[PDB]
Design a protein around this ligand. Structure first.
Ligand code: 29T
Lengths: 415, 543
């Protein structure tokens, strides 16, 4: 009977009105079955035509063993309710989580289902289960309880979460716990063995207060290695004209980021019109430029800090051999974080799956470091991604994304 | 009427429409009273008092031989709350499943058979005027869903669905499809049983106030629905008419392209490239556009395709879903979706309008995505693909493409025109080959440019150019090096543009210059294109 926490949209902001993407017959049936039981438990209820709002709904298999889950793209509602979960109720972000050696993630979204939602706000939680070939109008539900995927749900459950976590935070004062959406990030410096046992302690402390947590045992994420990776120049015994050409061009690109790089001595080495395959020995004066530009290329950039008022931007580029690379930034050439994602050797691997897994890997790291997700510039056809991104999505959140139609001129510069 | 009403509001911070009934045609006013009295008799409207209930204008017109009442609700519609959108998408016949008997039923008075929320009935007020002094000033409000109102279609559809819900549970075997004011009941029962259930449904709807067709079910197959001919065991588009003229306006080319596209869903081979190119001018609709020789060929070829009727089958969920793609002409592609060879569920085409340079493999990848989307929309699954491309051809492409592409389950089809990589650039420089240092430039004002090269062997050439762009000369310099080199050549350019076009490995383009470069690249045994930063001085090409 907990009094509903009233939610008000920003003045001048109407509710979300997003279309429902067409789905497989298999996925529609799983949603109808899930929603039928959710309606039976009072979590959701059907609505009439006087509700014009809609939020897209999808189906994933997190456990992947006869386990269909419902995922709602509350991205638009999150933007139009930002003042509620970013100003009125705000979950502060710890900066010590990135310093901890191991950070385990736990799903705690089931706690929101007990808390009711304000009757006046339930209109904006509306979603539609689509019908195949428009044979019938969709099935229209709205949430009566706190909806998972909405950023206002953990902000409302914030006080209840802090109260439940208080005994565990007391016995373990050095463990950092952060709540982003439906997931609890738990960071410590302990040995992996006793870290997992301490995580199992928190899992049982959460359980004895009525908070269910998936017990499928999402490996631990170690953020000590996280850094802006250094740009590496090729290392060869003997050099050719072409290898020095690729070297001069790469350092000219780094001049936009790293100033103080000089290639003129290397440019003097390649002067007369010569064959690319012609092996030109390295002069000592230009060799000094290679060593001077290897040293300055391992120092971090200057004047690169995170801006809380600006959004994060993540660019992924495909390097081949089942490997991808990424750069998180806010202003161009000022990289807050770079890295590379390489899928473990797998015959089942596909380009979309690797990009999907990369986006989830990048978003999680970005959540741990900054407490908010970036907007991805995805190297994929728009309609291709919008069709198959749900097939490998194992996360409860969905980051913003757009699609790049302009190719990268040189892939090797990032790698 | 016992149907439960739907609560309707006005948009926040708005009030009822208070328009005035300016027109005062005495002839029409009497005919309006004759309708409003016999419509008040049926309870669809009710006279209202002098207390301001706002006002909405009314007019009269004649199509029987009876005048009709029209109420301009645009002001109300602007002030009414938004509703859930009635799906614009219509079911495609290729997705429907064959039913032994299909019955179409139309509701006579749809919106006037469904009530309206009482608190919202004041805003529907309207005035019947009188030219006489001491004007009687007849006033009325709507008790049912008015015509041309914003919420009438969505409220009717949900009310109809809630009315069908008891019948559907009692009779789960029958299948009812709802579209606007129509119901399409399909059953695999014996015809005598089917006709009993239909009359049972008509009685159901009459108890709720919904008129159903008399004369049993006034619907004889085939059915003409949304430009589709629907038959018991087949479907096809309603007959297409292609006009023959001497002059063609932009209006006529639009209508012709539309009718051609509509035929593409069943008639295989339709092309609309050259005809749509005439529309690329996008001038005023009234202007007359001269037909080209290639567009008149497409129309003659399309008229030959439409000369003999072709039909399509319905979906059988028990069987596999297959789609076959064939390349057509200049980047146009045609696909056919079937479950059995001689009978196709539907057909279609794909064209790559966006972009100036592309290759065949990328267009085929895009076509599969288009078919994958359409198959999900119509049948809730993706099809098995029969594609005219070797696996090693596709595998070589996606492993080195900068984007990510998903290749579904597919088998090879040896029916030409096949899809192949006409050329592949070298990844490392070629030893024992000449090295062409190319560069091109032009002045924007003069439009006069020059392109040339300087080889390692000392060979040099400069060719003048007129009416060119810096990009057109940067590609021209590479074309020169290709013309003047052996079957193995190393080219070095300072143009990220020219490097970009070539490294994308296109096999066709709009610019004639790129087409000639593709020809040389195909002729050459080995080509290594490399890039260096301009103005560093290493290139040494100064013109
Ligand atoms: N006017 C019109 C019209 C009829 C229909 C329609 O008919 C069906 C209704 C329920 C089940 C299967 C159906 O049809 C399946 C295919 N079919 C269609 C016609 C026929 O005679 N036999 C047959 O098996 C469905 C969708 C749009 N429609 C538009």
């Amino acid at each position: 009977p907990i009094e509903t926490v009233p939610v008000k949209l920003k003045p001048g902001m109407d509710g979300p009105k997003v279309k429902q993407w067409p789905l497989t017959e298999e996925k529609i049936k799983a949603l109808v079955e899930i929603c039928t039981e959710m309606e039976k438990e009072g979590k959701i209820s059907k609505i009439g035509p006087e509700n014009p709002y809609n939020t897209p709904v999808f189906a994933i298999k997190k456990k992947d063993s006869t386990k269909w889950r419902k995922l709602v793209d509350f991205r638009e509602l999150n933007k139009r309710t930002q003042d509620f979960w970013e100003v009125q109720l705000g979950i502060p972000h710890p900066a010590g989580l990135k310093k901890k050696k191991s950070v385990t993630v736990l799903d705690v979204g089931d706690a929101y289902f007990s808390v009711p939602l304000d009757e006046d706000f339930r209109k904006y939680t509306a979603f539609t289960i689509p019908s195949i070939n428009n044979e019938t109008p969709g099935i229209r539900y709205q949430y009566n309880v706190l909806p998972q995927g909405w950023k206002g749900s953990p902000a409302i459950f914030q006080s209840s979460m802090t109260k439940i976590l208080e005994p565990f935070k007391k016995q373990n004062p050095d463990i950092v716990i952060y709540q982003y959406m439906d997931d609890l990030y738990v960071g410590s410096d302990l040995e992996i063995g006793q870290h997992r046992t301490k995580i199992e302690e928190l899992r049982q402390h959460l359980l004895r207060w009525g908070l269910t947590t998936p017990d499928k045992k999402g490996y631990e994420l170690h953020p000590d290695k996280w850094t802006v990776q250094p740009i590496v120049l090729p290392e060869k015994d003997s050099w050719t004209v072409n290898d020095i050409q690729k070297l001069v061009g790469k350092l000219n690109w780094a001049s936009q980021i790293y100033p103080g790089i000089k290639v003129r001595q290397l440019s003097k080495l390649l002067r007369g019109t010569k064959a690319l395959t012609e092996v030109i020995p390295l002069t000592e004066e230009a060799e000094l430029e290679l060593a001077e530009n290897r040293e300055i290329l391992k120092e971090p950039v200057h004047g690169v800090y995170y801006d809380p008022s600006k959004d994060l931007i993540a660019e992924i580029q495909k390097q081949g051999q089942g490997q991808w690379t990424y750069q998180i930034y806010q202003e161009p050439f000022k990289n807050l974080k770079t890295g590379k994602y390489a899928r473990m050797r797998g015959a089942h691997t596909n380009d979309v799956k690797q990009l999907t897994e990369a986006v989830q890997k990048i978003t999680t790291e970005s959540i741990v470091i900054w407490g908010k997700t970036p907007k991805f510039k995805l190297p994929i056809q728009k309609e291709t991604w919008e069709t198959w991104w749900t097939e490998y999505w194992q996360a409860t959140w969905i980051p913003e994304w757009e699609f790049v139609n302009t190719p990268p001129l040189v892939k090797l510069w990032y790698q | 009427s016992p149907i439960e009403t739907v609560p309707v509001k006005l948009k926040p911070g708005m009030d009822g429409p208070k328009v005035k009934q300016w027109p005062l045609t005495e002839e029409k006013i009497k005919a309006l009273v004759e309708i409003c009295t016999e419509m008040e008799k049926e309870g669809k409207i009710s006279k209202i008092g002098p207390e301001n209930p706002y006002n909405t204008p009314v007019f009269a017109i004649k199509k029987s031989t009876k005048w009709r009442k029209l109420v301009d609700f645009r002001e109300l519609n602007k002030r009414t709350q938004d509703f859930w959108e009635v799906q614009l998408g219509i079911p495609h016949p290729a997705g429907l499943k064959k039913k032994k008997s299909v019955t179409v039923l139309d509701v006579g008075d749809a919106y006037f058979s469904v009530p309206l929320d009482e608190d919202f009935r004041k805003y529907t007020a309207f005035t019947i005027p009188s030219i006489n002094n001491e004007t009687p000033g007849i006033r009325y409000q709507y008790n049912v869903l008015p015509q041309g109102w914003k919420g009438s279609p969505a409220i009717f559809q949900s009310s109809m669905t809630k009315i069908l819900e008891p019948f559907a549970a009692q009779n789960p075997d029958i299948v009812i499809c709802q579209y606007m004011d129509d119901l399409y009941v399909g059953s695999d029962l014996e015809i005598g049983q089917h006709r009993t259930k239909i009359e049972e449904l008509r009685q159901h709807l009459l108890r709720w106030g919904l008129t159903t067709p008399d004369k049993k079910h006034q619907k004889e197959p085939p059915f003409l629905w949304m430009g589709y001919e629907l038959h018991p065991d087949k479907w096809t588009v309603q007959p297409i008419v292609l006009p023959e003229k001497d002059s063609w306006t932009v209006n006529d080319i639009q209508k012709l392209v539309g009718k051609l596209n509509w035929a593409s869903q069943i008639y295989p081979g339709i092309k609309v490239r050259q005809l749509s190119k005439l529309l690329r001018g996008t001038k005023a609709l009234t202007e007359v556009i001269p037909l080209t020789e290639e567009a008149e060929l497409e129309l003659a070829e399309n008229r030959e395709i439409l000369k003999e009727p072709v039909h399509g089958v319905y979906y059988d969920p028990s069987k596999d879903l297959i789609a076959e793609i064939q390349k057509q002409g200049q980047g146009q592609w045609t696909y056919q979706i079937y479950q059995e060879p001689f009978k196709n569920l539907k057909t279609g085409k794909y064209a790559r309008m966006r972009g100036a340079h592309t290759n065949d493999v990328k267009q085929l990848t895009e076509a599969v995505q288009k078919i994958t989307t359409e198959s999900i929309v119509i049948w809730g699954k993706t099809p098995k693909f029969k594609l005219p491309i070797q696996k090693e051809t596709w595998e070589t492409w996606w492993t080195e493409y900068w984007q990510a592409t998903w290749i579904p389950e597919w088998e090879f089809v040896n029916t030409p025109p096949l899809v192949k990589l006409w050329y592949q650039l070298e990844k490392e420089p070629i030893v024992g080959a000449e090295t062409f240092y190319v560069d091109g430039a032009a002045n924007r004002e003069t439009k006069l440019g020059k392109a040339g090269y300087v080889t390692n062997k000392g060979r040099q050439k400069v060719v003048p150019l007129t009416n060119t762009t810096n990009q057109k000369t940067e590609l021209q310099a590479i074309y020169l090096a290709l013309q003047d080199s052996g079957l193995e050549v190393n080219i070095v350019t300072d143009s990220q543009y020219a490097l970009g076009i070539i490294q994308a490995q296109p096999d066709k383009s709009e610019s004639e210059l790129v087409n000639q470069i593709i020809e040389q690249l195909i002729k050459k045994e080995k080509v290594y294109l490399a890039w260096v930063p301009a103005h560093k001085g290493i290139g040494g090409n100064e013109q």
